[PDB]
Amino acid sequence: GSDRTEALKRMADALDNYVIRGVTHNIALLREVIINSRFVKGDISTKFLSDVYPDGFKGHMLTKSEKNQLLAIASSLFVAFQLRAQHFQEN
Amino acid sequence: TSVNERIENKRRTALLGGGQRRIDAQHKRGKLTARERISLLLDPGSFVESDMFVEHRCADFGMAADKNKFPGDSVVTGRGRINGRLVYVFSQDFTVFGGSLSGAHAQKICKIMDQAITVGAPVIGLNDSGGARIQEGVESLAGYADIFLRNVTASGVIPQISLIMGPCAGGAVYSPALTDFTFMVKDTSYLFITGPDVVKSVTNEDVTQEELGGAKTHTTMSGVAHRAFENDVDALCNLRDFFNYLPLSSQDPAPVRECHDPSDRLVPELDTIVPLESTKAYNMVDIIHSVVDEREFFEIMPNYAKNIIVGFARMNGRTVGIVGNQPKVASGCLDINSSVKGARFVRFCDAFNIPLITFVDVPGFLPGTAQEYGGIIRHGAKLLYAFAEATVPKVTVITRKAYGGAYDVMSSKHLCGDTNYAWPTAEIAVMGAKGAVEIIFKGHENVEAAQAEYIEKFANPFPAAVRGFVDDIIQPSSTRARICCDLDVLASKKVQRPWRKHANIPL
Ligand SMILES: CC(=O)SCCNC(=O)CCNC(=O)[C@H](O)C(C)(C)COP(=O)(O)OP(=O)(O)OC[C@H]1O[C@@H](n2cnc3c(N)ncnc32)[C@H](O)[C@@H]1OP(=O)(O)O
Ligand SMILES: *C(=O)CCCC[C@@H]1SC[C@@H]2NC(=O)N[C@@H]21
């Protein structure tokens, strides 16, 4: 991108639109590191990951608003399948 | 006391059934009541209860006592809808005389059986019974006979589904044998004629309740139950999903539902599934999941006769049945157990106008005295018969092996098939190169040199295709597109057959 924020935002978007299924991949780790406040500011050392994840990688941690969005999306998608299940060709 | 007060008092008792203390025990054991199960199964508010005020008329052995007068007489019957589609249900209530069958009990079930046949709607039974009610004696035996007569009459007319939600003993254990699918609940449901008490008394054998007739036995070893589910809530959730596959009656075409999965997409993942080396197995399920709409597949008997895969799926919205081999198990060979499961599935789908898709990869039959003495010949004829007599669209794709008589058993084109596709890895022959060449050139010199020439000419799908056995040889990635095209034009197919009172299956 033209600047540091544009390239990072575009990377975040590419990772969420990148479909890998059949194996275990490391997208969750890449998606969280690039959005880390130290990475965006640039306070990165060669041992960065060892201090951020001293007990291992745990996955993306949700905040209050993100949990509400995840619950709303999962609930709306659940209902969308329940409604599709009722649309038959008329007998 | 007014009549309205008496009516209200009967309504309250009918809802409690066997009483609150029994209901409390019902939950302690981890079971739902008969009415709670229906509320989960059917669309909210759609259920209408029939004959809620019927009571038994037996007066002998103290049955005339007020303490025995349970409105509903141990069954909840009525009608409703699942996703807007009409279905009839009944559920046996274990808290009232142990769920035992009375004369009036059967009568109510028969009533539902008759309305469903007349209109053309499926019947779903939730069975849980301790057997015949001995206080009435022979009245309950007539009850079973009348139910059996309806279950036979309804065969091929309306789907019949039986979900077992508890123990089942005596004559009751035969109704799931007449219906089309039997499902169970793990560690909760049982199917047996006599209990362990009789086995110990008759013969010197030691067995417990789970070993004799538990859900794990019937879904893994005897081949009686089509699938067991972990608990009551999950069992009914999957039952609603299963229901959505089937037509309401055999007079109806396979249901077609809204579908977002483009019918003309390719599946590149198929081109490399089948190894070039003949001794390397692969998972047939990977092919099935990639072809079917949105990768949804409903597998039947996942733990029984694993060498053959049968189940339900949709393609372009239309329900289809899928049958295929599993090369991972017993090299993909046919045996007694696989023929029984296959023939039963094929026949149901034909009766209710559900197209068949066949994925062939079968090297022959399982050899050995275990199968010879078991009647492998008599049993293999069941699958050949089920395909040969089918009148619904049949689309066969051969993914790799098809040796010997198994070629024709697995729905070959000459059994009135509609289309037959081969992948480039398919090989159709009476037997493999080793057997065929050593037999043809028996006692000759330089057999291995002759084998090299034989393999180059015959170890491929071409000597069959050039004779009209195969309609095309397709890149595997296009399989879904080809099948979708055939299904949407064979759906209007009609054929005639000579009249016969009934079919005569080899048994
Ligand atoms: C040969 C043939 O095919 S005919 C078979 C005849 N079948 C029967 O009569 C039932 C078989 N034997 C039994 O009764 C067994 O106990 C079974 C099959 C009901 C299973 O027993 P369980 O699941 O443990 O239920 P259990 O018998 O403990 O239930 C007890 C209650 O149910 C009722 N009950 C149990 N068995 C029967 C029965 N055979 N008939 C009528 N009511 C029964 C009792 O009223 C008893 O009352 P309670 O609430 O005060 O205890
Ligand atoms: C080697 O011993 C040859 C084994 C036979 C190959 C398989 S096993 C069962 C099927 N029957 C048959 O003739 N071929 C198949």
DSSP lists the bridge partners of residue B360 as B398
The beta strands (E) that lie in B254-413 are given as: 298-299, 308-315, 318-325, 356-362, 394-403
Q: Are B330 and B281 in contact (CB under 8 A)?
A: no
- Resolution, expressed in angstroms to one decimal: 3.4
State in Å: Cα B227 to ligand 1 middle. Answer: 26
Point out the catalytic residue in the list B405, B465, B481, B491. B405
Q: Are B479 and B397 in contact (CB under 8 A)?
A: yes
Report d(CA B335, CA B370) in Å as an integer. Answer: 10
The helix (run of H) or strand (run of E) holding residue B90 is strand B85-92
The amino acid at B456? E
CA distance B430 to B364: 10
Paired tokens of B107 = 């009568």
Rounded-to-integer distance, Cα B502 and Cα B348, Å: 16
Chain B residues touching A85 at Cβ < 8 A: 83, 244, 257
**Which residues neighbour B338 within 8 Å (Cβ) at sequence distance 6 or greater?**
B305, B307, B308, B383
- Residues with Cβ within 8 Å of residue B297, at least 6 apart in sequence: B285, B288, B289, B311, B312, B313, B322
Query: What contacts B125, CB < 8 A, 6 or more positions away?
Result: B89, B90, B91, B92, B109, B160, B161, B162, B163, B175, B179
Rounded to whole angstroms, how far apart are CA atoms B366 and B332?
9
Tokens of B312: 């339900």
Report residue B473: phi and psi, to 5°: -120, 120
Residue ranges of chain B whose CB lies within 8 Å of a chain A CB: 83-85, 244, 248, 252, 255-258
Contact B256, B317 (CB under 8 A): yes
Cβ neighbours, 10 Å, residue B205: 9
Which residues are paired to B163 by β-bridges?
B126, B183
Distance CA B373, CA B370 (A): 6
Cβ-Cβ contacts under 8 Å between A and B: the total is: 21
Residues, chain B: 507
* Distance (Å, whole) CA B22 – CA B34: 12
Residue labelled with tokens 């060709």: A89
Any catalytic annotation for residue B19?
no
> How many whole angstroms separate alpha carbon B283 and alpha carbon B399?
12
Residue in the block written with tokens 């998606």: A31
* 3-state secondary structure at position B229: strand
Smallest CA–CA distance, residue B447 to chain A, in Å, is: 45
Torsion, Cα B359 B362 B368 B373, to 10 degrees, reads 40
Q: B181-185 and B227-229 as β-strands: parallel, antiparallel, unpaired?
A: parallel
Named by the residue before each, gaps in chain A exceeding 2.5 A from C to N are none
Residue B399 neighbours by CB distance under 10 Å? 24
- SS3 state at B309: strand
- Contact by Cβ (8 Å): B436, B457: no
At residue B107, what is the residue type?
Q
Sign of the dihedral defined by the CA atoms of residues B491, B496, B499, B505, in that order: negative
Q: Which residues are B307's β-sheet partners?
A: none
Kindly give, in sequence order, each residue whose CB lies less than 8 Å from that of residue B175, ignoring residues fewer than 6 positions away: B125, B127, B147, B148, B151, B162
Any atom of ligand 2 within 6 Å of the Cβ of B213: no
Neighbour-count burial for B12-50, b at 16+ CB within 10 Å, e otherwise = eebebbbeeeebeebeeeebbbbbbbbebbbeeeebeee
Residue B79's beta-bridge partner residues?
B48, B88
The tokens describing B469, both together, are 């056995």
Alpha carbon B432 to chain centroid distance? 34
* Partner-chain contact B257 A87, CB within 8 Å: yes
Record: contact B248-A91, CB cut-off 8 A:
yes
Asked if B329 contacts B300 with a C-beta cutoff of 8 angstroms, the reply is no
Element (H or E) spanning B428, and its range? strand B427-429
| Yes or no, beta carbons of B258 and A84 under 8 Å apart | yes
**What's the token pair of residue A68?**
């509400």
Of residues B170, B342, B417, B432, which has the active-site annotation?
B170
For residue B318, the 8-state DSSP code is E
Query: In this complex, do B256 and A88 lie within 8 Å of one another by their Cβ atoms?
Result: yes
CA-based nearest distance B85→chain A, Å: 9
CA B451 to centroid of chain Cα atoms? 45
C-alpha A24: how far from chain center: 15
Nearest ligand 2 atom to the CA of B364 is 10
Q: Are A81 and B240 in contact (CB under 8 A)?
A: no
Cα→Cα distances A83→A76, B83, B84, Å = 10, 9, 11
Rounded-to-integer distance, Cα B281 and Cα B332, Å: 9
Q: Which atom belonging to ligand 2 lies closest to the Cα atom of B432?
A: 14
Helix (H, G, I), strand (E, B) or coil at B49: strand
Residue B244's closest CA among A87, A60, A43, A36? A87
The angle formed by the CA atoms of residues B174, B178 and B180, to the nearest 5 degrees, is 130
Phi, psi of B400 (to 5 degrees): -155, -90
**Residue B131 falls in the annotated catalytic set:** no
